[PDB]
Design a protein around this ligand. Structure first.
Ligand code: A1JB9
Lengths: 247, 251
């Protein structure tokens, strides 16, 4: 309803919807009139024959609503499939230095291409975790930044520690895996014979649960000591970095 | 276009559609609270600290609360700029090592044993396949304390596979609002750190040498961590094949 989150750019990849199971033909415009109620729409693409297309709505909010309202809707004789398109150009930035803001991160990565958003991630106290996100409008810009940031040392502040840039690992902690989408085969039925429950001493489960809990503890040991060598090696190198810059 | 649009799988009046309001004038009233937020539909519990100058109000959907939050933030009221925000969830848990064929519903049924579950989701990757991690948010922190304690002392099994889930406090990260420039104290130290714009270290320069050492250190970390990850993977898949054999040696 005119709603734009402060900072949000419009018609970014994050408000772009995939539309699947379309009926044969469907003019571009028809596609548009389905999404009429959900605001203006930029790019529209329908595929010749394979019955899918993309629509780019204005704000992410507008697209969420349109997503859950139109997902599965029948038209002629088939269920629409409507999901947020996979982002083609989102990057994880690691080891951000201190005094970096969303806007600095954006400015820095602007030299690689047009930036849809950049966010310095903060924990529940508001302190930056050291990771960021950078989403470009096009795959070419993220390829530039990926490549140039591995070959060279990209420095955001005077602190001589370069950020590490890798592709963003896109996880969905919102829709998840509805019971409707679980593969229901023989293994499914085997998993589901018993309901959730606590393993009881003397059962065959209990013996293996304890072995697993022990293994998880053997992983805590190993991993807690790597963390050891790692927090040491970094602190060593960061002192020398800070001392060096004393000039 | 309807107000009560609810993301599928979303209950009403959860912690996730509760907004906090700070910087209130001393003569704020509950009726004023509800009036500020009418428009954003039905309102549930409304609390107002009698004098710490904050309060909070349960809206019905996360969607309405996101619109209220943008519209009401920094609104002046009788001399004060209102600060409107989401709080971090008080009862939000991470579940590790999900067995296969687990759904959001199963995950929620399972954890509803410990208290009222607001939301449960099996995290799915970008090709739709379960990551093995999950989220469970309870309506109140004492439910999540119970789940933590009981899943730690005992072995909680969601299916027939004899692998208990690990349950720990979820690490709430904000990858949406982030760290906006306006929040940053722009003093002497800020400006010294910003002296050099973003740039690539050029060879023959005091940064260049140290950036390289860091890149080497990153590489060394990665290699070390890959050695652990592979050892872990081999050991997990050995015990997991034993578990599977043992579950067939029942069926
Ligand atoms: C807003 C938020 O998510 N918080 C508030 C602070 N806590 S905490 O880590 O300070 C903490 C408070 C209470 C507590 O036990 C009752 C344990 C820790 C946060 C947090 O992570 N809360 C989730 C949580 C943590 C532990 C337990 O049981 C021991 C339950 C729930 C972050």
């Amino acid at each position: 309803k005119n709603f734009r989150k402060p900072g949000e750019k419009t018609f970014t990849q994050r408000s772009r919807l995939f539309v699947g199971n379309l009926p044969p033909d469907i003019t571009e415009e028809e596609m548009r009139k389905l999404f009429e109620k959900y605001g203006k729409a930029g790019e529209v693409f329908i595929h010749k024959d394979k019955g899918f297309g993309f629509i780019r709505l204005e704000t992410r909010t507008l697209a969420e609503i349109a997503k859950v309202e139109l997902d599965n809707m029948p038209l002629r004789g088939k269920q629409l499939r409507v999901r947020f398109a996979c982002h083609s150009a989102s990057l994880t930035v690691r080891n951000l230095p201190q005094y970096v803001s969303n806007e600095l991160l954006e400015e820095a990565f602007s030299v690689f291409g047009q930036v849809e958003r950049a966010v310095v991630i903060v924990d529940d106290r508001g302190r930056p975790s050291g990771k960021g996100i950078v989403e470009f409008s096009g795959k070419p810009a993220a390829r530039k930044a990926l490549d140039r940031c591995s070959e060279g040392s990209f420095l955001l502040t005077t602190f001589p520690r370069p950020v590490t840039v890798e592709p963003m690992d896109q996880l969905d902690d919102e829709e998840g895996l509805p019971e409707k989408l679980v593969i229901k085969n023989q293994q499914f039925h085997k998993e589901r014979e018993q309901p959730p429950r606590f393993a009881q001493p003397g059962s065959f489960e209990y013996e293996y649960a304890m072995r697993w809990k022990a293994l998880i503890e053997m992983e805590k040991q190993q991993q807690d000591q790597v963390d050891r060598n790692i927090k040491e090696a970094r602190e060593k190198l960061e002192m020398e970095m800070e001392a060096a810059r004393h000039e």
